[PDB]
Design a protein around this ligand. Structure first.
Ligand SMILES: *[C@@H]1O[C@H](CO)[C@@H](O[C@@H]2O[C@H](CO)[C@@H](O)[C@H](O)[C@H]2NC(C)=O)[C@H](O[C@H]2O[C@@H](C)[C@@H](O)[C@@H](O)[C@@H]2O)[C@H]1NC(C)=O
Ligand SMILES: *[C@@H]1O[C@H](CO)[C@@H](O[C@@H]2O[C@H](CO)[C@@H](O)[C@H](O)[C@H]2NC(C)=O)[C@H](O[C@H]2O[C@@H](C)[C@@H](O)[C@@H](O)[C@@H]2O)[C@H]1NC(C)=O
Ligand SMILES: *[C@@H]1O[C@H](CO)[C@@H](O)[C@H](O)[C@H]1NC(C)=O
Ligand SMILES: *[C@@H]1O[C@H](CO)[C@@H](O)[C@H](O)[C@H]1NC(C)=O
Ligand SMILES: CCCCCCCCCC(=O)O
Ligand SMILES: CCCCCCCCCC(=O)O
Lengths: 158, 267, 158, 267
């Protein structure tokens, strides 16, 4: 995978606005959308109306239904920081099943990939050295996290 | 149905892709002319039919699942620095599952509405519209009915709210074999998340003692989408004290091309 | 300068116990010290007696005499973290002369080098992305901080 | 006296070094036979005589100013991976000043005492021994008398405490033209520093909620060098939760060669 580029957004904006790419993708059939493709839309953001103030009752319902619920953060993000999510999740008041512990890429490995807590009904994971967009900073660790989630199995302790 | 949406090849595609791809539009409202665009990357595994199905969504509100999720984070390809060639991502998540990327709501990326009042959205309407995309995609792709299904993504609002609507409607759409949800980097409760932001910024050396003290006294309780002018005044001092760092990854180098594509603090 | 090596301690242990090096340095004349050269002594650490609990009265006597007093931290250190020094220095209750601000290598430069507060009598500086041993991680930034200290000039604002 | 201390050249030394170097022992107790080793790198400047004089000290207590200060951090040379030859450091601090490294107290590095009981030290005896060193170093190097002088280094105790003994004796030794001090990463007040440690570790995701609340309840007040059993029990759980990170630089990679040279948690 190439080294990190803080200007990489510009490459998919150029690529996704190429006419031949839109044809192959079956997107913007016959120029039907009049503005160009861009990554985020300011008008959807400025015009948003109802935004809930508390999703914790939605979480109690999903956990009551017996659904697998996992949440994770990158620890160098300051927009939604680790402290915000830890305080919100701690307010659900769930029983701890596996206490806060460091996880490794394999039980025999030495570099901490991040830390994790398992409550009864919910697993929380942090990824060390990763920003808001975790897979662009730590791709191997995000892939391991996705595989463990699909299995329903904890992140590897040593 | 699906055959028309089959993507046979993409410009700048590297030489060995072996998994199937589909892309097109699903109309979710015939009267208003509202349609969502999706890109599907099948599992690059020996038996694709064994792998689960995963819906990925980015948030903001307002950002693209294809522009962030597929092309910069977890999809099979990344775009080269020449803006014309693709390269394969060895940690692509379709190595463990069939991944569906949808741009939602209409007005994001390639998704659109012929009625512009449709571009004024809200949380409950976003969840109803994306649930409707889902039941209509399953009708176009019936070989995924009853397959093990997960919802994943970067929005503390869209992923728990869509999950609640799928679950409440399970007797109406029994063929969606919903197993669980994976939430990344998301807002969860306005009061608790506002206290943790002012605290973490101070313990990382990003703000002053007095921005922290004022922030904790006037901002907890404010909405992030509809802020009061009292808290906007402290919030704005906080961000000026932080300087020219990228707030999404505070130790990395910053991009030099000045007309930045991100014009709002997308959450 | 070569990139960061986490194992660089071992190169110094080896070079400083070479006999030709001890000769050129005029160190350990005639094999006078029994034990070999090492970076740190466990016997000095373990036999340590009297250790003060509060240095703030010493800081007040040096500031009052008009001596230049600067303090700095690396912000990825967890042994004496930025939070600990921030709280101890704040307990001096000195008036602020320049409020917390980001500093750059030059006023025209783009990347944040760290943050700084100037009180009446004491300057505090953090170096972004540097651990406890600040010059091994951020050498250029530590040289600039040294030069500003000698001139008695604040770290460059924008 | 100083001419005998001149270092003519080091094994493995690079080709362009133009500055002067001196090294040797200064006996601070004739009776017990106690002596400190020093290495002096002069300013690499157009007129070194114009440049100030700075004493650099590392802390621990117990670690070496030459091993840490000079060879890995701010000195003129850096060691190659073969452990046998040297390279020039272009951000060396002797490009702006004359830098004096002393290993202190005796027992550290090359510094020794011929009376064994001298190796049990305390804060006041350390400041007195390094002040005596300084008075005696100036008589060997009489041309640095009254040069603009600064004390800098990595110990929250040694740098303020030696500065207080130099300052209180300025009418006794006026030739030490003491201008100020630079303190790096140091312990300053046991109570405030201890609250700051448990709070910073929690806000960086290193410890659990309950290690943080117990730590804040039993440890502020305790000494770092002589802790109560109550606080040691919490402290050891906290170091366990952090795992195998390097605690001096929490985001970098760890050294594989695990017979580590550092066997204590040096402050
Ligand atoms: C939004 O309005 C546009 C323009 O009226 C619709 O596209 C046009 O639809 C008419 C009637 O089907 C067709 O004759 C035009 O060729 C077609 N495109 C243009 C440029 O006029 C659009 O819906 C239609 O889009 C076309 C491409 C096709 O897929 C058709 O099946 C579809 O109904 C309207 N969008 C929606 C969601 O209704
Ligand atoms: C610690 O004791 C040793 C051993 O007595 C001293 O070195 C020896 O000193 C005697 C008498 O000066 C001399 O004849 C020996 O040749 C000398 N070295 C050895 C291996 O015995 C040492 O102090 C002395 O160290 C020598 C190298 C020299 O610098 C001399 O000037 C100095 O007095 C004692 N350490 C101290 C700090 O006194
Ligand atoms: C759709 O195509 C037209 C040209 O045919 C282009 O100007 C417009 O920007 C495109 N819209 C998107 C979203 O790419
Ligand atoms: C001093 O020299 C002796 C004899 O060569 C050696 O064995 C010893 O380890 C040395 N001590 C130091 C501190 O280098
Ligand atoms: C410099 C990167 C900025 C990316 C901003 C996008 C955050 C939007 C929410 C999300 O999908 O995560
Ligand atoms: C991996 C680096 C560990 C360095 C440990 C020594 C810290 C001692 C005090 C000092 O900074 O002088």
């Amino acid at each position: 995978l190439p080294p990190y580029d803080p200007c990489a957004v510009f490459n998919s904006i150029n690529y996704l606005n190429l006419p031949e790419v839109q044809t192959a993708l079956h997107a913007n059939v016959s120029g039907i959308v009049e503005y160009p493709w861009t990554v985020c839309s300011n008008t959807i953001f400025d015009q948003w109306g109802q935004a809930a103030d508390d999703l914790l009752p939605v979480y109690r319902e999903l956990i009551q239904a017996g659904l697998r619920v996992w949440v994770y953060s990158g620890d160098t993000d300051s927009v939604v920081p680790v402290s915000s999510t830890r305080r919100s999740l701690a307010a659900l008041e769930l029983p701890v099943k596996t206490s806060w512990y460091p996880w490794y890429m394999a039980p025999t490995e030495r570099e901490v990939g991040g830390w994790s807590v398992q409550y009864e009904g919910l697993t929380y994971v942090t990824v060390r050295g990763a920003g808001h967009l975790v897979p662009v900073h730590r791709p191997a660790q995000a892939f391991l996290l996705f595989k463990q989630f699909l299995k329903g199995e904890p992140m590897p302790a040593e | 149905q699906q055959e028309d949406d089959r993507i046979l090849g993409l410009p700048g595609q590297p030489n060995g892709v072996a998994f199937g791809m589909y892309g097109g539009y699903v109309t979710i409202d015939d009267n208003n002319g509202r349609a969502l665009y999706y890109w599907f990357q099948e599992a690059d595994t020996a038996d694709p039919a064994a792998a689960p199905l995963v819906l990925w969504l980015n948030g903001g509100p307002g950002c693209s699942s294809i522009g962030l999720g597929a092309m910069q984070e977890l999809g099979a390809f990344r775009v080269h620095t020449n803006g014309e060639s693709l390269l394969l991502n060895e940690y692509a998540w379709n190595k463990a599952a069939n991944i569906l990327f949808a741009e939602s709501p209409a007005g994001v990326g390639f998704s659109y509405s012929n009625t512009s009042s449709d571009l004024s959205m809200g949380d409950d309407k976003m969840a109803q519209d994306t649930y409707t995309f889902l039941v209509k995609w399953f009708e176009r792709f019936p070989h995924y009915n009853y397959r093990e299904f997960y919802i994943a993504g970067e929005s503390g609002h869209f992923i728990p709210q869509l999950s609640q609507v799928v679950y409440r409607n399970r007797n109406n759409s029994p063929f969606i074999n919903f197993q669980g949800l994976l939430v990344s980097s998301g807002l969860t409760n306005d009061h608790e998340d506002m206290i943790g932001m002012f605290e973490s910024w101070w313990h990382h050396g990003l703000i002053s003692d007095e921005t922290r003290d004022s922030g904790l006294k006037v901002c907890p309780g404010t909405s992030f989408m509809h802020p009061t002018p009292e808290c906007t005044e402290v919030w704005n001092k906080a961000l000026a004290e932080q300087g020219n760092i990228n707030p999404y990854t505070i130790y990395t180098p910053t991009c030099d091309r000045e007309p930045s594509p991100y014009q709002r603090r997308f959450w």
